[model samples]
Target: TVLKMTDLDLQGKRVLIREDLNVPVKDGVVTSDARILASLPTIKLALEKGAAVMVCSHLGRPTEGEFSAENSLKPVADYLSKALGREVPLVSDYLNGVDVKAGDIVLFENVRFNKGEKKNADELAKQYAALCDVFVMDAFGTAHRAEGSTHGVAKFAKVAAAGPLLAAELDALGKALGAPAKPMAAIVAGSKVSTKLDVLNSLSQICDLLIVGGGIADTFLAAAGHPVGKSLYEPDLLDTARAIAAKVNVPLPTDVVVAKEFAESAEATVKLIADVAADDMILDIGPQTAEHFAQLLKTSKTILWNGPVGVFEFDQFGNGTKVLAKAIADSAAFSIAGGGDTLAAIDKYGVADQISYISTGGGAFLEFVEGKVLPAVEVLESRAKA
Candidate 1:
C-alpha cells in the first residue's frame, strides 16, 4: 500500500511537492487554472501542519539544457498567490539563496529549467531532496513520467507520500479496476488500433463487454472480412485486430454515416456497413448503431470510456459520440471517462457532472488501464515499503 500525506509528520519540515501545472497559457496569461486549483488541498494541509512548502512543476517542453522566459512558471506563481490569498514567492535559485520558514509556501522555477530533470539525474535529485525533509507526489498527470522531481526525489527524502489529489486519483481508479459492479463494459475508440492495442487486449480480459468505435472499428470490421470502403483504417494492423476479435467479443458498428467529402458541409448519408460506396468515407456511426451501443450501456453496471466515437469537432459528426455520452450518463452504472477527446465530448454533451470520475490524466490513464506500473506511483509504493 502507499502512504498518504496525512501519514507523515510534517511539522517544522520543509516539504517538497511535485505537481502538474502544465496548463495552457497564451500571452503570459494562464488560460486555465484547473490544475492549480487541484493542488490547493495538499498545499493547505501542509500549511495547517506547520510545514514549509516548496512547489515544483514544469510548465511546458523547454530546451534540454537552457532556460526560456516563455516557459517560466512566473505566471503560474502569480495565479497561485492569488488563489492562496497570500504572497507565494517565486524563487529562481531555491537551492542557495531562498530561506524558507514554517508555513511559508515557495514556488520554484520550472523544474525543466534544469537540464537534469528529465534525465532523472541522481545528483540533482539528491540536491532537491536535501532542501526538504518530506516529499509529496501529487501530479497524476505526470505519474507516467519518471523525472527527478517526481520519482528520483522520493528516494532520498526521509518521508514520502501521496498528496490529496494523487491519493484521490489512486483510490478512484483502484476501486474501478479492483472490484467494479457486475456487467462491466468498456468503450475503446481511437483512430489507430496500433495506439490502443494493449489497452484493448487488457480490457478484453476484464470487461464483460468490449465496444469498439471510430476509425479503429473500421479496421476491426475489415479484419472480419467486411468492406470498410474509404474509411480510415490501418491495413498493417488487420492481423492484430483479427487476433483481438478472436479472443474478445468486440461489438462492431452495423451501420455508419458516410460522407462524399470529409467536412461539415459535405453531403452525407447513413448506410449499412457492407453498403459503403467506394467513394464514400465513414465519419460517424449511424443512428441504428448508436442505439445498439446505448442499449449495451444501459444494461451495464459499470462503464469505462476513452476516446470519442466519431470526429466530434465537427457538429455534423458529433451525434454518435453525443448519444453514447447521454446513454452512459443516464445509466445506473458507475462511470469513469478519460482522455482529451473523451472529456471534450463529455463537456460538449454537458454530461461531465453525471460521470462518477473524470481523471486528470491522459497517457497515464491509458497506461494504468493497460496494467503497466507507473514509475512515480511505483516509487511511492516502494517508499511505503521502506
Candidate 2:
C-alpha cells in the first residue's frame, strides 16, 4: 500500500513536487504543453490547501552540469504562470536565502544542472529535503530512474507521499498487469525483438492472447520457417523467437504488406507469408491479419498495447496501425496503451479518449510491465510502509 498526497496534512506547508516537465523545446520554446498541463492538478491541490508549492523538474540532459539557457526551466515557469493566472517565480540558487510562503508557487532550475543530481548524492538530497515541509513524487516518466530529487530526497523529507498522477499511474498499471480481467490480450510491437524480449516473455506468461507485429513479427515469421524476404528482423534471435512462440500463445501474421523499397512513394503489395519475394521488404501486416488481430481483441476482457503495428510515419504503410488503433478503441475491454509511437497512433486516429489509460512514461512503463521494481516507486512504497 502507498500513501497518497491527499493523506497528508499539507495546509500552510512547503511542498516540493517532482514532476516530469521534459517537454519538447525548439528554439527555447516549449513545443508541447501536455506534460505541463498534466501536472496542474497536483500543483493546484497544494495551493488550494494553503501550501507553498515548489516544482522541480529536469528538461534535457546538460552534460556540463552548468547553467545553460537552453536547458533552463524559465520558459516553463512563464508557461505555468500564464496557465495558472498567477506569477510563478523561478529560483536559480535554492539555498541563497530564498523564502517560500503560502500561496507562492516556485519553480527550480533544471535539477540536472548539478552533477550531484544524477549521482544521487546524499548532501544534495538532504539540501532539497531541508527546503520543503513535504515531498511529493509525481513524475511517472522518471519513476524508473533513481535520482537525488526523486528517490534520495524521500528518505530525508519529513513527509513523503505519492502525488495524484503517480498514484493513478500505479493503480491503472496494477489493474492491467497485476489483476487484469480474464482473457486479457496484449499487442507488443516494435522494430527489434531483442529490445522487447523481456516484456514479451513476461506478457506471454500472463496474457491469454499475444499478438506480435512490426519488424519483430518478421523475426517470428522467420522462426516459423516463413520467407520474410528483406524484412527488418534479428537473424540471430530466430531460435529464441521460435522458443518463445512455441511456449506462448503467439499469433503470427499470415499475410504482410510488402514493398520493393522502404519509402512512402513505393508501391506496396499484400503477400501471403509464404509468397514474400527475396527482394521485398515487409512493412506492415495485411488487411486479413489486421482483421484477425481485431477479432482477438474483441473477445478479450482486457487489453494492453505498446508500439505501432506498422511503420505509421509513412502515409502509405500506416493502414495496419490505424486499423489496430481503431479496433482497440472500439473494443469494450479495459484498454491501456503507452510508448511514444503508440500515443501518436492513438492521436493520429483520434481515439485518445477511448483508451482507458495512456501512460506518460515510456521506458518506465516497459520496466513495470517487465516486472521490475522502479526506484522512485519503491521509495514511495517504503515510505508508506514506514
Candidate 3:
C-alpha cells in the first residue's frame, strides 16, 4: 500500500519530522541545499494538513556533549526560513514549553549537541518525544546510523512512520533489488576496494553486468594477470576481486587507457592490456571499455551506477565518465545513480533531470544495496502500530 500524504490526517496534530538536513556547511552557510529541497514535499504536506511540524537533524560529527558552532543546524533553520519565506520559529530550550499552534513549524537545535543523542539513550528519547505527538523518520541519509533524532525519538512517540522521501527511497531500491527489468546492469566505481568490497560482492550475485572502474579497477586488472603498472591498486584486495569474478558472471575490462605519468598532463594514451608499459599509470577505462559499457546499456531494463568511472575532474580523462553518464541518461532503462560525485557528474553533463531517481544517502544507499538494515527504518518499524 502506498503511504499517501492524505492518509495522515495530520490536521491540528503536532508532527515531529526527522529530516536529513545534514548538508555540507562551510563557515555557517549551507554549501548545498539539495537535502533541504528534497524535504519540501513532506513539510508542505504536513502544513497543508494543518499540522504543526517540528524538524530536527544533526549537521556534522560533533564530540559527545560538546557544542561546536560549526556543527550547528541553526544555519539549516536559517536556510529553511529563507526558502519558506517565514520564520521557522525554533525552540532552543526543550524544558521551557514554547507554545506551538496549528500549522506552526519549529526547527530544533542540532540533536547531536547532547551526549545521549549518539548513545540512543532512552532518557533523551523521552525528552525529544515530549515535543511532538507523532514521529516521522525522513532522514534516509542517516538511516543507517542509529542516532537520537533518527532513532531515539521513535521509541517515545505515539506513532512512527516513514515520510515520503524514505518511502520513495525504499521503493526505488526494492525495484532494483527485487523486481528490476531484465538485463539489470550496475556500474560500481570508487577509489578504494575496501570501501566497496561488500557492495561489489553482493552485486555480483544479482546484476547481469557489473562494470568496475576508477582507481579501484586496478585490483581486478591485476588479479586477471594484467600489469597495473603505477596505477592505484589495493594489493590486499586483488585476490578478493579475482575470487569474486571467478564466482560470478563478470567480465573484466579487456583494454585500458594508460598514461606514462600519473598526473593529468602525463602522456595519456590508450592500449590493449598486453601493450601497457611497466612505467605507465592507468587513469580511466579506455574508449573501448566505454563503448562496450554503452552497448550493454541498450539492453538494460534497470541500471544502478555509483562513483566516477575516471578522473573526471581532469579534462583529458573525463571522457569515459561523460560518455557513460550520457549513455545511462539516454537508456530506456529505469536509471538510478547514487553518491555525491556521481550525481555531480550527471549534473555537470546536464543529465540529472533525465535520471529516474537520485539518492540522497551515500552510505545508507550503499548499505541498502548490500542488504544492511538501516537503524532509522528499524526504529520506525519498532514504533509503528500494526
Candidate 4:
C-alpha cells in the first residue's frame, strides 16, 4: 500500500492529483479543512520532488449543466493557497490549455461541475488524462463512487498512483481491523440501521469490544425485550442485528437518556436499563454507559469510532458523545474517527486536537472498514504496477 514519491522518481513530472477537497460549507464558507489538510503531506512531497501538482476535486452536489456557487471548490483552493503561502491558480477547463510545469501548482474547478463526472465518461476522463504525465487519485471521500475523475481518469493515464493519504487510510484501517494492535474497540453510532449493517457485521468479527449506541442500540435493545417507543430502528435488519449480537463481543447500554421529543429542549430523563419505560425513546447513552465505554478505551490499543453516541447536534442529547470524546482524548490508544457529524462531535467536545487521526472521508471510510474494495485504489494499484 506504500507508494513513496521516491519510488516514482516524481522529479520534473506533471502530477495531476485528485484529492477530496469536499468539506462542509455553511453560507459560502468552508466549515472544515481537514480533507485539504490531509492531502498537504502528499502535495508537499511532490513539490519537494520537483513535481508540478495539478489538483482536482468535487464539492457538494449541483444540477445538470449548471454550477452552484455553494458547491464550488474555489474556496478550498483559496484556503490551500494561503496554507502553502504560494499561488494556486484555478483552471476551469483542461481542454482549454491549462499548462502546468514542474514545481507549479494548479487546482481545477469542481470536477462535478460537468454531468460526465458522475457517469465515468471516457471522453471526460481522457480530457483529464491529457493534462499530465502521472495521475494520483487522493480523494478517498469519493472512493466508493466510480466517478469519471476518480476511476475513469486512470483508464487513460500512462502512470497512476494512490497518494499518501489514500495509502495511509488503507494501512491504518487494515492495521486496526485486519491485523490490529491488540485489544481493539469499535464505537459505532448512527441514526439508521440499514446504512451501517456492513460495518457492524464486519467489525463484530474483529473488534475485541464493540460499543453500540445511537439509533442502532434501540434495535438491539428491542430484540432483548425492551420497548424502543418511537426511536429509529430497522425492523427488517433486526435478524441481522440479533445475529451480530450473538456472534460479537458487544457492550449494550446499561443506562440511557430517554426523551419524549427530539429537540434541544425535549423532556429528557435518565433511566437504568430496567426502568426505561415503553413510552420513552432513548436519545443518548447515560453517564454510566459513557464511563463504561471509556473504561473499555483504557485497555484498547486501537480504537475506531464512527458516528456519535447520541444526538450530539443538540446540547441536551450530546453528553454521551461528549463523554466519549473526553475519554478518547485522554486515552493513549491509536484512535481514528470519520463522518461529518462525528467530526462535529470531536470539535464540540474540544478533542479534535487529541485524536491520532480524523479522516476527511465518509462513505469511503465505512466501505473500506467493511472490507469492500475501493475502485479508486484498485485503479491506482493496477496502473502503478503496470
Candidate of highest lDDT: 2
Per-candidate TM-scores read 0.97, 0.97, 0.94, 0.92
User: lDDT (0-100) at residue 349 of candidate 3?
Assistant: 86
lDDT of each: 0.87, 0.88, 0.82, 0.82
**Per-residue CA lDDT of candidate 1, range 182-284, in tens?**
7989999988899998899888778888888887898998998887887879999999998887777788888888888865578778899889888887888
Give residue 109's lDDT in candidate 3 (0 to 100).
Answer: 79
Candidate with better TM-score, 1 vs 4: 1
RMSD of 2: 1.3
How do all the candidates rank in terms of lDDT, highest first?
A: 2, 1, 4, 3
| Residue 352 alpha-carbon offset, candidate 3, angstroms | 0.4
Off by over 4 Å in 3: 1-6, 262-265
Put the candidates in TM-score order, highest first.
Answer: 2, 1, 3, 4
Q: After superposition, which runs of candidate 2 have C-alpha atoms over 4 Å from their true positions?
A: 263-265
lDDT string, candidate 2, 1-386, tens digits? 77788878888899999999988887777889999999999999989988989999998898746788999898898889999998999999994346889989899989998668998899889888999989999999998998998899998898899999999999999999987898999999988899999999888888888888887888888888889888778989999898888777888887888899865587989989899999998888898998888887887888999988888787677888888888999999899998988999888989999999999799999999999999998988888874
TM-score of 2: 0.97
